[PDB]
């Protein structure tokens, strides 16, 4: 009929009333109808809370991959509306484990590509570190290799790299096929653009110690105004701290000092020295015995 | 107990009420939780004793298997520091 509001409400009373946990197979179906109704309504929240509760319960019980995937398919549609890329990465990360055991590797190797790819979209990832290490992330498929090399592009970056790379590679880098299925090709480009720019500045703070302003904008391939805006946003986030000379065209990478900061460094060299002496002692003991012979 | 609830039928109304208040929360907490109300916790018997009153109390214990624990009130007074407190 088109009575979205009325269906959602009748469902809400029911699931709590019927079941604490007694039968899952029936409970999950009712929950599925609600989730579908919840996306259309604009009521993002009720679904998110329900998805989280049911997921925990199924994992603890006898496991079934299918059930899980159904929670996820609905979630991402809500996630697009919001936009937490971190959120989708986590939820998919735990289903990756269920996929590992149960399911064949044709599903699995695209899921791996997809989690690292959400983490590209957002700024940083704690989570990414775990994934990059794996040995099935750097062989096999085209899509796996492209994905491992893009996270490597941010580390070496000079930012003349990116459109050549973007254009050449999109098997999965405006695309998906086992997660979102795509978001919008132009809209993914936006997320990619902000991350590469941001990451080129993060690596430059560590590597350099002075850079001219003319040189920084040249790497970013943007106008001085635009480099200036990205610098502002980053110092605010407080991942990097820098000082700006707008009329004299220097970006310093300096941040506060106290003498006591360099005291710790002095007392670290002392510390490398004491530890050296312990090694030295044992070494002498080994060396002598050989001399004798 | 020493008697069952068929051994003392003809106190019916009182049988039915005690059944529902003591047995039933053990068997399903579940119904009282879904609703969200707390479970029953106390029962009081008054009446003259051993007319049916004592009979009820034993009879209920039997069916549940419940362990009957009898307290004599004048065992809970003894004349030393901190014994009364400890027994209850």
């Amino acid at each position: 009929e088109g009575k979205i509001d009325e269906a959602a409400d009748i469902l809400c009373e029911l699931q709590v009333e019927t079941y604490g946990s007694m039968e899952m197979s029936e409970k999950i179906q009712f929950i599925l109808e609600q989730m579908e109704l919840s996306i259309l309504k604009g009521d993002y929240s009720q679904a998110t809370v329900l998805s989280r509760k049911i997921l925990k319960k199924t994992f603890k019980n006898p496991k079934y991959e299918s059930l899980k995937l159904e929670y996820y398919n609905l979630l991402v549609k809500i996630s697009l509306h919001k936009r937490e890329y971190l959120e989708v990465a986590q939820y998919l990360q735990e289903i990756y484990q269920t996929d590992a055991i149960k399911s064949d590797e044709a599903k699995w190797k695209p899921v791996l590509s997809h989690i690292v790819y959400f983490l590209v979209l957002s700024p940083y990832g704690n989570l990414q570190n775990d994934l990059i290490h794996k040995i099935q992330n750097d062989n096999n498929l085209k899509k796996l290799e492209s994905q491992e090399s893009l996270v490597k592009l941010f580390t070496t970056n000079e930012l003349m790299r990116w459109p050549i790379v973007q254009k050449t590679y999109e098997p999965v880098l405006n695309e998906d096929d086992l997660a979102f299925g795509g978001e919008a090709n132009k809209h993914h480009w936006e997320d990619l653009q902000k991350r590469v720019i941001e990451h080129n500045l993060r690596v430059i703070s560590e590597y350099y110690s002075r850079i001219t302003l003319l040189r920084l904008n040249e790497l970013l391939d943007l106008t001085e105004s635009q480099t200036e805006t990205y610098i502002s946003d980053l110092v605010n986030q407080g991942i990097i701290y820098a000082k700006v000379n707008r009329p004299a065209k220097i970006v310093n990478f300096e941040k506060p000092k106290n003498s006591s900061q360099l005291l710790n460094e002095w007392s670290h060299n002392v510390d490398e020295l004491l530890e050296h002496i312990e090694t030295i002692g044992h070494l002498i003991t080994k060396e002598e015995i050989m001399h004798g012979l | 107990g020493e008697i069952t609830f068929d051994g003392i039928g003809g106190l019916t109304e009182q049988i039915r009420e005690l059944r529902e208040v003591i047995e039933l929360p053990l068997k399903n907490p579940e119904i009282f939780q879904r609703v969200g109300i707390k479970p029953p916790k106390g029962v009081l018997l008054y009446g003259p004793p051993g007319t049916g009153k004592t009979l009820l109390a034993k009879a209920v214990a039997a069916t549940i298997g419940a362990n009957f624990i009898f307290s004599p009130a004048s065992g809970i007074v003894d004349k030393y520091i901190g014994e009364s407190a400890r027994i209850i």
Binding site: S232, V235, A242, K243, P247 | -
Partner: protein, 54 residues
């Protein structure tokens, strides 16, 4: 259209103005008072007097 709200908005507009001024400078100074003046939306004089107060 009620006076009570209108007074707080007045007060808040000042505090925000100084809070913006501090936000802009926060990647650090060695920056030209002409540039700040354009970005915030204001004239030269008002900026100089508020930047001193801050």
């Amino acid at each position: 259209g009620d006076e009570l709200t209108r007074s707080h908005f007045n007060a808040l507009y000042d505090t925000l103005l100084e809070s913006n001024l501090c936000k802009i400078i926060e990647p650090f100074e060695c920056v030209e008072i002409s540039h700040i003046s354009k970005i915030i939306g204001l004239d030269t004089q008002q900026v100089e007097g508020k930047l001193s107060q801050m």
